Amino acid sequence: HMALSLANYLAADSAAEALRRDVRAGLTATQKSLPPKWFYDAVGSDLFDQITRLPEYYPTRTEAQILRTRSAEIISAAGADTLVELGSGTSEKTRMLLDAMRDAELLRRFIPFDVDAGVLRSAGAAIGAEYPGIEIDAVCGDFEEHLGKIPHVGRRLVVFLGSTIGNLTPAPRAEFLSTLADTLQPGDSLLLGTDLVKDTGRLVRAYDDAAGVTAAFNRNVLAVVNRELSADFDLDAFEHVAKWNSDEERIEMWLRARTAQHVRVAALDLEVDFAAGEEMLTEVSCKFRPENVVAELAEAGLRQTHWWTDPAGDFGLSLAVR
């Protein structure tokens, strides 16, 4: 139920100032963009959750099927008694790993790391109930600044699923993996999910679903700016566009102005203009080739010891060690 330890390294005032800096930079650039760090408020996070269940969004069920069939092998390979989860604690994927650790009579500790303390408290309560006696040490932080705050107690399996790593472009991605690798002791393991290059139509449809849910997620980034920075974006005036960028092998989401728009962002003392048809970059989702996953891990100081992939080659999971 309520047994918990929780450390909180994210302050409201610090987040508000970062949002102001990031939005000003994006909206005043000649090629406009909005910073994805701020897309995932409560509404945005729930819309993303819904995306994970859409028929076109293959990553979640694909990764789940890999875990469903290989979680025992993963847990045996890791030999860990402590599961560190980078992001959330709410998914069935988490429970597949915890269940396998319990089956192996190894499970002692769960360390969820996420930006939302409320979500962490919910996860603590649910997991504490399901695995009586488990120690839960939650960390509320940003995995680009607070990885050093993750406790080093135990033999730790650190998991970063969902190809969330694809939301980082190459420079911050390398910095993240390097920083993460530096926190791993001998005996610790990283389990990394990566969505793989594949048929471009399938890739684009995963981010442009027939039901319009991804489009709602995308437009909600404007609602966040409207609310937090007292802006007057007309959500209805922007069209959702998903593209495959073949040079960078990433999906890009864009908002395209239907007609010319004048936007006042009062909190920034800023007025910006969109031409009819002008596009603004929002979320990106980098996709990987299996050989390059090995190389990226090696560049960070990690050796890939295991690779699991579905039979169609849609998605991959790596286990890697120092």
Swiss-Prot record:
A Pfam entry, by short name: Methyltransf_33
Residues annotated for L-histidine binding in this entry: 57, 167, 207, 283-285
Outcome of gene disruption: Cells lacking this gene are unable to synthesize ergothioneine (ERG), but do not show growth defect. Deletion of egtD from wild-type M.smegmatis and a mycothiol (MSH)-deficient mutant does not affect their susceptibility to tested antibiotics. The ERG- and MSH-deficient double mutant is significantly more sensitive to peroxide than either of the single mutants lacking either ERG or MSH, suggesting that both thiols play a role in protecting M.smegmatis against oxidative stress and that ERG is able to partly compensate for the loss of MSH.
Top-level EC class: transferase
UniProt superkingdom: Bacteria
Record keywords: Methyltransferase, S-adenosyl-L-methionine, Transferase
Enzyme Commission number(s): 2.1.1.44
GO molecular function: L-histidine N(alpha)-methyltransferase activity; protein methyltransferase activity
Residues the record lists as binding S-adenosyl-L-methionine: 87, 93, 114, 142-143
InterPro entries assigned: EgtD, EgtD_Actinobacteria, EgtD_Methyltrsf_superfamily, MeTrfase_dom, MeTrfase_EgtD-like, SAM-dependent_MTases_sf
Catalyzed chemical reaction(s): L-histidine + 3 S-adenosyl-L-methionine = hercynine + 3 S-adenosyl-L-homocysteine + 3 H(+)
Pathway given in the UniProt record: Amino-acid biosynthesis; ergothioneine biosynthesis
Gene Ontology annotations of biological process type: ergothioneine biosynthesis from histidine via gamma-glutamyl-hercynylcysteine sulfoxide; methylation
Function: Catalyzes the SAM-dependent triple methylation of the alpha-amino group of histidine to form hercynine, a step in the biosynthesis pathway of ergothioneine. Among all the proteinogenic amino acids, only L-histidine is a substrate.
Notes concerning its domains: Consists of two distinct domains: a typical methyltransferase domain and a unique substrate binding domain.
Family according to the record: Belongs to the methyltransferase superfamily. EgtD family.
PANTHER family the record matches: ERGOTHIONEINE BIOSYNTHESIS PROTEIN 1 (PTHR43397:SF1)
Subunit structure: Monomer.
Protein name: Histidine N-alpha-methyltransferase
Organism of origin: Mycolicibacterium smegmatis (strain ATCC 700084 / mc(2)155)
Lineage of the organism: Bacteria, Bacillati, Actinomycetota, Actinomycetes, Mycobacteriales
